[PDB]
Amino acid sequence: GLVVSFYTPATDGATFTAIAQRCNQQFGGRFTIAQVSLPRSPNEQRLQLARRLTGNDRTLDVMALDVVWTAEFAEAGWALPLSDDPAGLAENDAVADTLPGPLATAGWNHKLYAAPVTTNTQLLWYRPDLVNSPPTDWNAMIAEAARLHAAGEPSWIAVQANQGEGLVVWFNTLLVSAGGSVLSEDGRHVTLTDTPAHRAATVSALQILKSVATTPGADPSITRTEEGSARLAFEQGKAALEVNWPFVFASMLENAVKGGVPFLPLNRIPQLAGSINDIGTFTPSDEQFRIAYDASQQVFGFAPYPAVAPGQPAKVTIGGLNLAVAKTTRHRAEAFEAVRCLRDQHNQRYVSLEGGLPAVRASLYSDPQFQAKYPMHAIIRQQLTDAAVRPATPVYQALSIRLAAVLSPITEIDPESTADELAAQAQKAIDGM
Ligand SMILES: OC[C@H]1O[C@H](O[C@H]2O[C@H](CO)[C@@H](O)[C@H](O)[C@H]2O)[C@H](O)[C@@H](O)[C@@H]1O
């Protein structure tokens, strides 16, 4: 039968290949989904897709889009509205049993242009054997890192951010938590410095970035261009504090069982032998999960994203992936049917428990079987309820490149002058409409 191509970030390729393989057993030979990988950064994911869409690649069917690409892809006509499903089923499927934060990321001008499949929100991860209590706010993060440094313990604050989208995400979370916003609601005005309250919020966020950058024991790689992984930095013992998306939980257990985490040698537990399956995925029994998780609790804990102001939780920038059907497809009906299978209940459970990516289905966050294997479920659902959002705008690509070039390196931030530079660069981006 026909093949529905399914483009996804390469780092999620194995997870989505597995989901596609399950979805291929249930179409009655009518068709096959074929996963195809995209590059690592959101901007290169977008670029590969945009070049196929403008090139009229008629083999491109389903795309897993970062949440920030909806406006551009809807406005360009590249993502079909869900109302273009010939079966008329896609819109109701996308909303039913789906958390509202993820859904909002999939809309443009009051219509859905994609079906959420994964969401994302950052948590604090820490070494409980080195850090007595998890820092509750950024001042406490800095104080704990300085303490670790003076004790000769690992002292980096490993935030998943370099010089790209992740740095923009970090800034956006600090900014919205402080009451600021990059753009107005409609995306037509820059709101970083246009009122005193907005300017004060921008300055407070930049002050946090600069303070973290210049804390004793800070990662010397802030001032370098080389890409870094906060996930690997922590797994290697180079940081005892990490701010990152929740896939690091699955990664900690799997890499520990593979032998890749020196302070958690789960591969030396005979009961865990053979729990990595034949293509490299940790697939434990219930007992093996208990053993691995219980052992991990001595050296790996999680907690809310640090607060920006003492006494109120942060507003944490939402992330994730939405499934869109490309205007190029020669088989809209099967592409939308594939989208519904790829996000069904069983595959949502899989994408979180094995793939490490937070599910979008509200039912799972209320399901004790899911909660038992996804122990950060309550913090995740709370942070998705009061999430910050990056600006929705068709010129997001240019806005984010401009903002990230100003913010990096964060050691060079001067709150007041950087605030004005950010606002001017943001204005250049939206002056391309
Ligand atoms: O779970 C890990 C995912 O990490 C990246 O995506 C997240 O981080 C991006 C950069 O800050 C955000 O734009 C995105 O919305 C987040 O989901 C990576 O791009 C994904 O492939 C990973 O699944």
Side-chain angles (χ1 to χ4, degrees), residues 17 33 41 76 96 123 165 194 200 204 223 225 294 369 381 386 392:
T17 291
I33 304 166
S41 79
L123 282 68
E165 189 60 34
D194 65 321
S204 83
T223 65
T225 281
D294 286 357
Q369 294 212 161
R381 196 187 68 195
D386 346 326

Side-chain angles (χ1 to χ4, degrees), residues 9-12 39-42 45 66-68 118-120 122 160 165-167 169 244-247 318-321 356-358 390:
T11 197
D12 309 305
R40 169 205 92 55
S41 79
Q45 285 152 36
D66 205 328
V67 297
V68 293
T118 60
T119 185
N120 231 347
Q122 285 185 23
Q160 188 43 60
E165 189 60 34
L167 178 57
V169 160
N244 212 340
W245 312 103
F247 80 115
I318 191 169
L321 297 169
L357 301 178
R390 286 164 283 178

Side-chain angles (χ1 to χ4, degrees), residues 41-293:
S41 79
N43 185 68
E44 293 261 66
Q45 285 152 36
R46 171 212 167 271
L47 185 55
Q48 290 293 121
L49 293 172
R51 282 176 190 169
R52 292 178 186 274
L53 290 152
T54 59
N56 201 31
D57 172 2
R58 299 310 306 282
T59 72
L60 165 69
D61 296 314
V62 183
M63 330 169 264
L65 298 182
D66 205 328
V67 297
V68 293
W69 299 135
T70 300
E72 183 183 10
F73 275 56
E75 187 72 25
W78 294 342
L80 301 179
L82 297 193
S83 58
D84 275 357
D85 180 7
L89 302 176
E91 282 183 302
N92 292 331
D93 170 82
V95 298
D97 184 37
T98 302
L99 290 166
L103 270 175
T105 75
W108 181 245
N109 287 331
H110 309 302
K111 285 178 63 72
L112 288 171
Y113 286 87
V117 62
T118 60
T119 185
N120 231 347
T121 183
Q122 285 185 23
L123 282 68
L124 170 65
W125 308 87
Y126 68 103
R127 293 280 299 273
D129 56 319
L130 303 179
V131 168
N132 175 54
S133 59
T136 60
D137 58 38
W138 280 98
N139 194 74
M141 291 288 283
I142 278 153
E144 180 64 18
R147 184 192 78 67
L148 288 156
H149 170 73
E153 298 288 5
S155 55
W156 300 356
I157 295 172
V159 185
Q160 188 43 60
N162 287 284
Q163 297 92 52
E165 189 60 34
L167 178 57
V168 175
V169 160
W170 187 14
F171 170 68
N172 192 76
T173 291
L174 301 174
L175 174 73
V176 174
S177 293
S181 182
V182 178
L183 305 180
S184 56
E185 323 82 66
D186 60 16
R188 275 215 332 169
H189 305 276
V190 178
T191 51
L192 289 164
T193 62
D194 65 321
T195 67
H198 283 166
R199 186 185 185 90
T202 299
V203 165
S204 83
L206 296 170
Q207 177 63 64
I208 290 170
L209 296 177
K210 174 58 174 291
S211 288
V212 170
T214 57
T215 291
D219 182 349
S221 94
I222 302 174
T223 65
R224 292 308 101 112
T225 281
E226 55 200 49
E227 294 311 85
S229 158
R231 177 183 55 92
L232 293 174
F234 188 103
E235 287 183 8
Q236 286 163 16
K238 298 171 165 57
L241 302 167
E242 159 178 34
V243 181
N244 212 340
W245 312 103
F247 80 115
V248 302
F249 178 76
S251 175
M252 174 63 73
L253 299 187
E254 178 170 291
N255 280 344
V257 167
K258 289 182 173 178
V261 184
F263 55 92
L264 187 53
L266 294 188
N267 63 309
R268 297 196 170 198
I269 302 176
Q271 291 78 355
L272 295 177
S275 65
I276 302 303
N277 77 5
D278 58 353
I279 52 182
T281 299
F282 179 48
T283 65
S285 64
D286 288 345
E287 181 56 20
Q288 287 172 324
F289 178 83
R290 183 192 66 85
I291 292 164
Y293 181 50

